[PDB]
Design a protein around this ligand. Structure first.
Ligand SMILES: *[C@@H]1O[C@H](CO)[C@@H](O)[C@H](O)[C@H]1NC(C)=O
Ligand SMILES: *[C@@H]1O[C@H](CO)[C@@H](O)[C@H](O)[C@H]1NC(C)=O
Ligand SMILES: *[C@@H]1O[C@H](CO)[C@@H](O)[C@H](O)[C@H]1NC(C)=O
Ligand SMILES: *[C@@H]1O[C@H](CO)[C@@H](O)[C@H](O)[C@H]1NC(C)=O
Ligand SMILES: *[C@@H]1O[C@H](CO)[C@@H](O)[C@H](O)[C@H]1NC(C)=O
Lengths: 11, 662
């Protein structure tokens, strides 16, 4: 599962 | 079986930007806003797309094209960040990464209007009560200028130069329009100002503290670090922590210390009390706790796991992910005295970390009592007295092992008492990781699920969801009984890579949002929406509720002579509290105990530890003016700061003695 793609942040 | 979970929406974005920023507008708005942007880490971001939904994630509408330079600019817009209003959830502002240009909306993004502005919006800060009001900072400017807008970002005026940092004040402690700033000085350090008129008049500008390293604002408290040259230039500088409570002038706090203090970190500030991490120049960090409403810090726990770019952990992986110091220290949210910390024994790796917990705001600490039985049911052999306990991973522990997707301890005021954490049973944090759950605010745990998972809860804690980490999947594990049992739901036909599993902040819904990308192709964003009402099935009734306070776990002991009781649904009840559940909470004072009192100024504990009273201290030999009203003179015993104790015999006698005015 790729280490530097698909990162999520809530605001 | 009519499936107990519906897939209320499936959405492929056709977007492959590495990062997504999501905002629910809430207030039953039904609007969700997303920005797909390239990784922040690089300062060379190359493209962005913006999407908004109006049917609560059933379907997203791409609006990147509506962000343009008006009619007609072929230059292509690129968004760094977007900012929402705490005051008005309809309003939004998007900022171009390159162009000194902004976009605004008061209609949930239906209509966007472009404006150029006199600076680049590196950072904006929107007033939290006055929707129209906000500030904007241009870091990359040589003068580091600060601007205010009065009309939600159309027109600006530049109100200060050489700003290091800044913030609005806080209601109600500060006046309206109060702005704090650190301004740079020719010494390394900076001066702290407060202004009520946007730095227009000199008589409305106020110096808070001079020559500071950092400054921070937190409810009643303000903190700063000062480097003082006591011996002189030739001698050792002393690093000090300055503190204001209730906006009284800042004074330097007193620390009882073997060693030179190297830096301070404010770990938590609540109920008129402060947790500070004092780290020394030997890379050890201990944890102090403020007296209530006070500057009197005493040692609480030693060797807390801590990172600072200046200090400890600086020379490990963490530095590539954190540019600001922090600690593996957790406040169990919605509760007063409960915290979880990671201790460090040797050098920084799993083997040396153990978790400890407190229920008395750091008065005492224990290790975490491991669950008796595995998820499956078999006995777990673990004895506190053999140095075996439960240990929970936190961002730092995790960041060292480069595990960027793991879950920090989860706790929220939606579900007082409920903690879910990634962790391990053993001598330390270095074994297989599982998912552990407590609803006793940490007092007792269960092994909920074996592997690493993403987890979240909804319906005020009544339903929990989870997705196994590391490989592709289409299983959604869920539990309605605090993780005692689980059931799987297949959320899509072919398994997919999951990037996260969320609920609208507040955790009130039975809706969950899965983000991910499908397996076949390389990364492209994809969002599923999922309704789990039918897993709870029916509304709760008075029968499904029961009363609970943390006191109930630490043998009825109050905290600062008061305690909080919560109405919580029992663990076995299958029923739903409802989005509008308005959870009964009652705070009350409890009749007095010995632990509510301390020895008065110049009194002490007699040598006989066995039996403990206060006795006039010999070395102090030992009065209200003017008295006309009654004096109530000491018996040597004093209610401890902030303690709202009341009633009971121990109050009756142990309290101070009256003498009618001189
Ligand atoms: C219009 O296009 C130019 C590039 O030709 C760009 O620099 C500019 O930012 C756009 N509009 C404004 C107001 O800057
Ligand atoms: C503490 O950590 C730093 C890295 O920030 C390292 O260079 C140094 O050797 C350590 N200092 C001591 C006194 O152990
Ligand atoms: C720290 O280390 C010693 C041995 O190196 C060990 O016996 C002890 O259990 C550890 N102490 C704590 C508080 O973890
Ligand atoms: C979830 O499903 C139930 C019907 O089973 C419905 O009452 C509820 O409003 C749904 N919520 C949403 C946000 O679709
Ligand atoms: C407890 O005492 C405090 C201060 O002594 C008081 O303000 C508060 O009202 C009391 N608690 C309750 C539930 O009345």
């Amino acid at each position: 599962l790729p280490q530097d793609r698909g990162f999520l942040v809530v605001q | 079986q009519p499936e107990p979970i519906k897939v209320y929406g499936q959405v492929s974005l056709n977007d492959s930007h590495n990062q997504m920023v999501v905002h629910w507008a809430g207030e039953k708005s039904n609007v969700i806003v997303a920005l797909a942007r390239d990784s922040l880490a690089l300062a060379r971001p190359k493209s962005s797309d913006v999407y908004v939904s109006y049917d609560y994630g059933k379907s997203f509408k791409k609006i990147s094209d509506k962000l343009n330079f008006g009619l007609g600019n072929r230059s292509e817009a690129v968004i760094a960040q977007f900012y929402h209003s705490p005051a008005d959830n309809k309003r939004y502002i998007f900022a171009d990464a390159y162009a000194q240009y902004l976009w605004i909306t008061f209609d949930f993004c239906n209509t966007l209007q472009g404006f150029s502005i006199p600076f680049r919006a590196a950072d904006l800060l929107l007033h939290s009560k006055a929707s129209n009001l906000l500030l904007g900072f241009d870091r990359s400017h040589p003068n580091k200028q600060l601007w205010k807008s009065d009309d939600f970002g159309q027109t600006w005026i530049m109100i200060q130069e050489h700003v290091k940092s800044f913030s609005w004040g806080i209601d109600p402690y500060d006046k309206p329009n109060t702005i704090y700033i650190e301004r740079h000085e020719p010494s390394g350090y900076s001066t702290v100002f407060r202004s009520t008129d946007f730095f227009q008049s000199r008589e409305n500008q106020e110096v808070i503290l001079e020559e500071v390293r950092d400054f921070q604002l937190r409810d009643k408290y303000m903190f700063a670090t000062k480097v003082v040259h006591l011996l002189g230039s030739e001698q050792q500088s002393s690093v000090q922590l300055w503190v204001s409570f209730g906006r009284k002038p800042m004074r330097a706090a007193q620390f009882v210390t073997r060693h030179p203090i190297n830096e301070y970190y404010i770990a938590d500030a609540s109920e008129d009390q402060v947790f500070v991490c004092v780290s020394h120049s030997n890379n050890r960090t201990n944890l102090y706790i403020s007296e209530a409403e006070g500057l009197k810090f005493s040692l609480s726990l030693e060797n807390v796991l801590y990172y600072s770019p200046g200090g400890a952990g600086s020379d490990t992986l963490v530095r590539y992910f954190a540019n600001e110091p922090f600690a593996d220290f957790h406040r169990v949210e919605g509760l007063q005295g409960v915290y979880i910390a990671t201790l460090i024994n040797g050098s920084m790796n799993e083997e040396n970390m153990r978790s400890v917990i407190t229920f008395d705001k750091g008065g005492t600490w224990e290790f975490l009592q491991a669950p008796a039985f595995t998820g499956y049911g078999e006995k777990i052999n673990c004895e506190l007295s053999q140095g075996c306990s439960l240990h929970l991973a936190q961002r730092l522990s995790q960041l060292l092992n480069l595990q960027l997707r793991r879950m920090p301890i989860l706790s929220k005021e939606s579900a007082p008492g409920l903690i879910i954490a990634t962790g391990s049973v053993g001598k330390n944090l270095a074994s297989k990781t599982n998912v552990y759950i407590s609803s006793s605010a940490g007092a007792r745990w269960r092994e909920a699920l074996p592997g690493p998972h993403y987890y979240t809860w909804g319906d005020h804690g009544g339903i929990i969801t989870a997705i196994a980490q590391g490989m592709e999947t289409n299983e959604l594990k869920y539990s309605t009984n605090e993780g005692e049992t689980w059931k799987t739901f297949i959320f899509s036909e072919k398994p997919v890579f999951v990037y996260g599993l969320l609920t609208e902040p507040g955790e009130k819904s039975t809706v969950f949002t899965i983000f991910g990308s499908n397996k076949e192709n390389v990364h492209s964003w994809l969002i599923l929406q999922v309704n789990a009402t039918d897993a709870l099935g029916v509304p709760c009734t008075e029968n499904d509720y029961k009363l609970w306070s943390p006191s109930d776990e630490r043998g009825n002991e109050c905290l600062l002579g008061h305690k909080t009781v919560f109405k919580r649904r029992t663990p076995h009840a299958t029923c739903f509290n409802g989005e509008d559940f308005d959870r009964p909470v009652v705070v009350s004072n409890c009749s007095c105990t010995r632990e509510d009192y301390e020895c008065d100024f110049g009194f002490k504990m007699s040598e006989d530890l066995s039996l403990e009273v206060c006795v006039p201290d010999p070395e102090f030999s030992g009065p209200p003016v003017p008295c006309p009203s009654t004096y109530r003179r000491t018996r040597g015993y004093r209610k401890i700061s902030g303690d709202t104790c009341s009633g009971g015999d121990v109050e009756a006698r142990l309290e101070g003695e009256l003498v009618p005015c001189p």
